[PDB]
Design an enzyme around this catalytic site. Structure first.
Site, mmCIF file in Angstrom:
data_model
loop_
_atom_site.group_PDB
_atom_site.id
_atom_site.type_symbol
_atom_site.label_atom_id
_atom_site.label_comp_id
_atom_site.label_asym_id
_atom_site.label_seq_id
_atom_site.Cartn_x
_atom_site.Cartn_y
_atom_site.Cartn_z
ATOM 1 C CG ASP A 1 -10.464 5.367 -56.498
ATOM 2 O OD1 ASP A 1 -10.369 4.463 -57.369
ATOM 3 O OD2 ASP A 1 -9.502 6.109 -56.154
ATOM 4 C CB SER B 1 -8.049 -10.199 -68.434
ATOM 5 O OG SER B 1 -8.732 -10.483 -69.634
#
Length: 330
Positions: A35, A199
């Site tokens: 994770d 992004s």
């Protein structure tokens, strides 16, 4: 040193991925959910409330000659999906794919919430975010990667998740045969303890690319891709019959649909998520309404590049003094 371990989807939808981990002496192998959105290595154990264990493999510290109770230490964690666990702490030897850390904090669950009990395939989590998020008290503990970093050939790990297929986590090296083209690196903020990056934009199907900054986290522990409501609406508007359902808890779409791809920007580069990766199947057995793999982050507080996005790429978690993320097509 290096390590290399195969990671396997837990089910036919890729709801999560499990990676075998050796704990203790003699080794006890547990299948953990790696994770990158959390920083605790915790396991079902001989100390877990018996009614909360339903098929998981447990760690029994009393059978490990290298286990030592970390006196006074406790831990308690709550995840973005509402699940939680807590317990006490041992140190022990932990190996992943041939890479060994001695003295790793292994957090033994005394209590786990219902969603963990109900998932017999996941024996615990191995956190790979920054150690500043580790919940052990009163002495915070380091992640497996943080403990191993100094020994690794290069201070990196990579995630290469498969679509409906096994993939690989590598530690300490970049397998140049595992991706196509070049790896594009992008800046990381560790201010929230996550692998947080920006992004450069998105496209829906064959549509034109929209240049826009999207701050989010690279989170192998989250199944889906969670993005701003504007972006998600633009995606699902291209699927006839798709709608946001409050009763279901997100966008659903007719199972008869062919989904468009979704592209996200990494600097000047582009990662394309095939439409099939966005199909999470019937909302309930036999339904013709299917659950979407791109969902709104509006209720979270952060955008999440979960497995739907990460599995379309070869992802480098670069733990150099100034951390960065790398993405390549594959």
């Amino acid at each position: 040193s290096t390590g290399s371990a195969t990671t396997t989807p837990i089910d036919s939808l890729d709801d999560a991925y499990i990676t075998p981990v050796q704990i203790g002496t003699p080794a006890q192998t547990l299948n953990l959910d790696f994770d990158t959105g959390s920083s605790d290595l915790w396991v079902f154990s001989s100390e877990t409330t018996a009614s909360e264990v339903d098929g998981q493999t447990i760690y029994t510290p009393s059978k490990s000659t290298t286990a030592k109770l970390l006196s006074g230490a406790t831990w308690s964690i709550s995840y973005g999906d509402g699940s939680s666990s807590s317990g006490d702490v041992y140190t022990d030897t932990v190996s992943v794919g041939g890479l060994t850390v001695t003295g790793q904090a292994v957090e033994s669950a005394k209590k786990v919430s219902s969603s963990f009990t109900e998932d017999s395939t996941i024996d615990g989590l191995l956190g790979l975010a920054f150690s500043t998020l580790n919940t052990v008290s009163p002495t915070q503990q380091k992640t497996f990667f943080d403990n191993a970093k100094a020994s690794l050939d290069s201070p990196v790990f990579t995630a290469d998740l498969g679509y409906h297929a096994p993939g690989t986590y590598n530690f300490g090296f970049i397998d140049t045969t595992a991706y196509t083209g070049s790896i594009t690196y992008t800046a990381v903020s560790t201010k929230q303890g996550f692998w947080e990056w920006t992004s450069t934009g998105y496209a829906v199907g064959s549509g034109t690319f929209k240049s826009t900054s999207i701050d989010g986290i690279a989170d192998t522990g989250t199944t889906l891709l969670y993005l701003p409501a504007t972006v998600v609406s633009a995606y699902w508007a291209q699927v006839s019959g798709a709608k946001s359902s409050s009763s279901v808890g997100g966008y659903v779409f007719p199972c008869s649909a062919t989904l468009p791809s979704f592209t996200f920007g990494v600097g000047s580069a582009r990662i394309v998520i095939p439409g099939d990766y966005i199909d999470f199947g019937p909302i309930s057995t036999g339904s013709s309404s299917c659950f979407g793999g791109i969902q709104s982050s509006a209720g979270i507080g952060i955008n999440i590049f979960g497995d739907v996005a990460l599995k379309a790429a070869f992802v480098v978690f670069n733990g150099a003094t100034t951390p960065t993320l790398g993405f390549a097509s594959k």
